[PDB]
């Protein structure tokens, strides 16, 4: 049963109306954790390093094949607890947009 502090789109601790910290559990907590994990560049953990998405070696670079980017994103999604797998992972490329869509099948 995952649980996480409530954060806004600015990725900062967002409090409630009474000035407390909200602890989301299960589905919403897992969704927020997945969104936060997909925004972490590789080599940003002093205590994991090899964890994180390849935003500068697989994406944003003249990479021949985006299968490595797909694998890195899949690993980042699966790294979150209670994720099990991914039902669908679209890696569509627009003119200058790297559109990624996930269909996580988290156990909750």
């Amino acid at each position: 049963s995952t649980s996480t502090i409530r954060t806004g789109t600015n990725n900062d601790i967002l409090l409630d109306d009474n000035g407390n910290m909200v602890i989301l559990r299960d589905v919403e907590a897992c969704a927020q954790d997945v969104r936060a994990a997909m925004l972490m560049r590789t080599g940003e953990n002093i205590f994991d390093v090899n964890s994180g998405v390849g935003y500068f070696e697989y994406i944003f670079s003249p990479q021949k094949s985006y299968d490595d980017a797909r694998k890195s994103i899949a690993d980042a999604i699966l790294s979150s607890p209670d994720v099990t797998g991914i039902e669908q992972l679209d890696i569509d490329i627009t003119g200058e947009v790297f559109g990624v869509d996930a269909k996580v099948i988290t156990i909750h």
């Binding site: 039902e87 992972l89 269909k103």
Partner: protein, 89 residues
């Protein structure tokens, strides 16, 4: 085979349902052939006079082999997750 008159023109044939959470998995597989082979072993025991008593029978586990086409990478990854999934029947 017959036994059920669904009377419905959209019935799905194959279904791999996760027993816990009761959910479809790998729903985009294009199955082609399925072989659900059983197995069991006898205990033939020759004895004295020309004769052989088979004793009892032990039911070996069922094997099922599914040939399929995976159309998409996410389906292939779902199959890999099924193989790596050691905690669900």
């Amino acid at each position: 085979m017959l036994g059920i008159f669904t009377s419905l023109l959209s019935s799905r044939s194959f279904s791999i349902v996760d027993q816990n959470t009761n959910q479809l998995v790998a729903a985009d597989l294009r199955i082609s052939r399925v072989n659900t082979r059983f197995s069991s072993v006898g205990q033939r025991h020759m004895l004295e006079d020309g004769k052989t008593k088979m004793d009892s029978r032990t039911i070996h586990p069922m094997e099922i082999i599914v040939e399929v086409f995976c159309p998409s990478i996410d389906v292939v990854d779902q199959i890999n997750q099924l193989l790596l999934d050691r905690d669900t029947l």
